[PDB]
Design a protein around this ligand. Structure first.
Ligand SMILES: Cc1cn([C@H]2C[C@H](O)[C@@H](COP(=O)(O)O)O2)c(=O)[nH]c1=O
Ligand SMILES: Cc1cn([C@H]2C[C@H](O)[C@@H](COP(=O)(O)O)O2)c(=O)[nH]c1=O
Ligand SMILES: [Co+2]
Ligand SMILES: [Co+2]
Lengths: 178, 175
């Protein structure tokens, strides 16, 4: 019995994001997921280091790697309801069911977003919103105003998900994006 | 002090691999790195679960995420590229805000990998190149034919119980 699990994960790089706008450069889910992982890990390490945190940052990188993994079954759906969130959970679950049985308990808590602690959830949602904001900033620096709307809207999401670790992040790493 | 560190990591997606052949689909360092991290983690976890391992699979993910990070300063270097590499790493480390350097420096420079971790990340890197050959060969691109044959030799030299498990269980779905 062979497993199709990694065969499906290999198609992440095929799934394109932000379909409703002209993109100066088309982002795929695989590039996004690597950036969210790097960002969510950093947010966690900053939290731990500077803000009283006690979160497993390495664990948070791996959850970030897999946070949109079900896109390979569903496709990307641009965030602009309860039903969809439900479909995402079924897709996450079908992916889990592909993992060989003796391995399943390693991967379920990585793919199934029910398994995220409250803190792990906050950090990966903070990373995801930041990454989306960074995408907008790259596009606007490339002279593309189709992302102007989205930037402004993400500025609200980020204040909703505001933390000290995000504030540090925004102050220190974001201005080089402009 | 703002830092250009993440500005530069975001450029991983720009650096293309396998530049000397025709590719049906061009692969970038960012795609590669996520994939090596997924495979390395899997290998680590397999070893632990089936083969008496005691390795930190999450640490191994994180290492693999950053294993080619300096490629943003140098470009893809097709296999003293080791000298160029060491300089780019250090440049990337100098960019990290000082107060956080101890966190990232080991990730970038790769000086503190255990032996096991080196083995697993390097098995993952070879496997990922080998998967890329199968994908290209599946799309009728024979330019990856030699490479596939060579990597079967890289994989044999780096052979492990966990690699064997991975090849038997997950890789047929790619051919
Ligand atoms: C955050 C965000 C994402 N998106 C798009 C990008 C992707 O194509 C898709 C899913 O994004 P996600 O990774 O943030 O959930 O939605 C928007 O269109 N507007 C937004 O504000
Ligand atoms: C492993 C491997 C990589 N490469 C290429 C792909 C990349 O463009 C570059 C570095 O790859 P690496 O991630 O395996 O160090 O070398 C080969 O041409 N042949 C090989 O066997
Ligand atoms: Co996402
Ligand atoms: Co590599």
């Amino acid at each position: 019995k062979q497993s199709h699990f990694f065969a499906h994960l290999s198609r992440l790089k095929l799934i394109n994001r932000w379909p409703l706008m002209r993109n100066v450069r088309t982002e795929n889910v695989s590039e996004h997921s690597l950036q969210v992982a790097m960002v969510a890990h950093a947010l966690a390490a900053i939290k731990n280091r500077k803000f009283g945190g006690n979160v497993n940052a390495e664990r948070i990188a791996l959850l970030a790697m897999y946070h949109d993994a079900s896109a390979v079954l569903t496709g990307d759906l641009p965030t602009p309801a309860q039903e969809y969130k439900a479909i995402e959970k079924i897709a996450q679950q079908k992916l889990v069911d592909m993992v060989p049985e003796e391995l399943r308990d390693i991967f379920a808590p990585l793919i199934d977003e029910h398994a995220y602690s409250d803190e792990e959830k906050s950090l990966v949602k903070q990373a995801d919103a930041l990454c989306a904001y960074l995408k907008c900033l790259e596009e606007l620096a490339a002279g593309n105003n189709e992302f102007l709307l989205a930037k402004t809207r993400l500025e609200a999401t980020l204040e909703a998900r505001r933390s000290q670790e995000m504030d540090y992040f925004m102050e220190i790493f974001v201005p080089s994006f402009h």
